[model samples]
Target: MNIFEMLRIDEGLRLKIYKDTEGYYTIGIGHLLTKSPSLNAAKSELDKAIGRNTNGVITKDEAEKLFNQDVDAAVRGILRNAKLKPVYDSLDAVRRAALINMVFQMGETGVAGFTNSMRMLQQKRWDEAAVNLAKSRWYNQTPNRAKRVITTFRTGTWDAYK
Candidate 1:
């Protein structure tokens, strides 16, 4: 049988948070641990199904561990492969992390849609870069978050937005 069919029976993996047979803090495609969740990348995407406090099983650190791995993979895969490799490489750690946040929230293609902002970044036009970012649909989605990220983009320093 195919993977979906197999997962549909016996353990009956669900994408939701519900009780299982014997009902012991379950998650994923199955009520039981059909496979090891040592898979950090997978957890990064799926852990929310279990979220924090899955009967007090998962923690902040646990979630971060998985998410950090996913972030690493995204940078290594998507950012490195993009046309902006040189521009991205020139950024420092904190600023680079700012890009990572956007890349994850909006995907590589979505971030690339900010053409003027990207051009400002490539040209090292710090002020224009920040202002350009402030003009994004992303900005409207989360003004506070956009300010923080654009601040890092503009100043090359990390600053949390209030």
Candidate 2:
């Protein structure tokens, strides 16, 4: 199946996906994850998280939100895969997405403080790319998340479905 198909609109998957993304039960901020949610409810929640107002209505807002979420997921997955890190590092999209995701997950100042990665990205220097990625304060903060992304920036080739 194509990448889009893999992430297609499935109500069941949407709630699980959102819960995972928002770190639900383990934490406490995702949408209610009790019984399986209705398709409409799933759509509504997913829409808002993705910055959309429609479910499958195909509005421009929906499309944009879906697109943005896809990009975010793609980048996050890439960063989380060790083998794919090199591949992700080779792509400008991954770099931009990594920076954006880091800022989104952490904060603007936190992302801005990535002096090394920012410099490498600015200069487009591949060899030194991962170094800066590893130097961020966020690195050890969320070890798993931080390390995964840094590995991707350092290497590339992340899992698309992750």
Candidate 3:
């Protein structure tokens, strides 16, 4: 599967606004409206997309629009990260999807913090990269998603899709 399909599976959907793990106001496939450049502007767009405020409800189509933007930004974010770009370029489509999935969840800054893992990835040391990922609190925070991502890293396959 592509990055979009895999992301939809991993990130899930929320038509209604809700508080995320860090209590930021999020909606529409984990879109952090609170983190948006202009909260009022985004909220206005969201409201327009949904046809009304209606207590923060959004349509599936509207949510997909946000998802597409978020995914695109995540990819751009990864590509622009100095520490990540080289490794990202060295990987194949499947492995690249894995990295994109990670950047989508934690942002490029957070993923860049995995220096040892990035080093392993750069060297094509799959097992060591997976091991490094396992050692992080990120693994503990969402073990299921972490296991899939780690497996994808170790195998260079679409474990996230499976």
Candidate 4:
């Protein structure tokens, strides 16, 4: 099923059905699960609260704008945080984008946290990268996503982010 369908909001609920399979509340298209507000206005107010807490560093304005430019920015941020570009320099654009998508969903810090994984990727160690990817908490937490991206990293040909 599509995301909206999976969220049980394909017909469009009054508020976004931001929850996971376990019936826990969440936020973001990536379903960054957290304690979320129960109402749309509450969600907006909470976003404002977080925005204010961050000293406007992450504004409610930015949240609204995210449905636009911030999507790409978030993707780039993931790649930048993951240190993917240096390795990507040797890869095709399509492969690079695939990696970016994986890092985007997992967060760059998370990918980077995989020290062995990073070392393997840097060495162009495809099999080891695949093994490291599979051994990660990411693989356990988001198996489908991890599998897809790891497969692309292994094959050196498949592209999903384009």
TM-scores of the candidates are: 0.60, 0.43, 0.86, 0.60
Which candidate number has the best lDDT?
Answer: 3
Write the residue-wise lDDT of candidate 2 on 57-118 in tens digits: 34444444554565466556546645344544655654445554454454455555555566
Q: Which segments of model 2 are wrong by more than 4 Å?
A: 1-91, 159-162
For each predicted model, how many residue pairs clash, with residues at least 3 apart or on different chains? 2, 13, 0, 0
Mind sharing the TM-score for model 4? Answer: 0.60
RMSD of candidates 1 onward, in order: 13.3, 10.0, 3.3, 7.4
Per-residue error at 111 for model 4, in Å?
1.6
Worst 10 residues of 4 by lDDT: 3-12
lDDT of 1 by residue, 1-162 (tens): 221222233233344434444333344433233233344533443555455434424544444454445456657755565655665787766667677667755567787677777777878899988887887677886676577677778887643522
| Order of the predicted models by lDDT, top scorer first | 3, 1, 4, 2
Tell me the whole-model lDDT of each prediction, alpha carbons only: 0.57, 0.48, 0.83, 0.53
**Model 3 lDDT vs. the true structure?**
0.83
Best by TM-score: 3
lDDT of 3 by residue, 1-162 (tens): 788888788778998876666666678888876754555655775676557775577788888988988899998998888999998999988899999989988989999999999989989999888988899888988899888888888887775567
RMSD of 3: 3.3
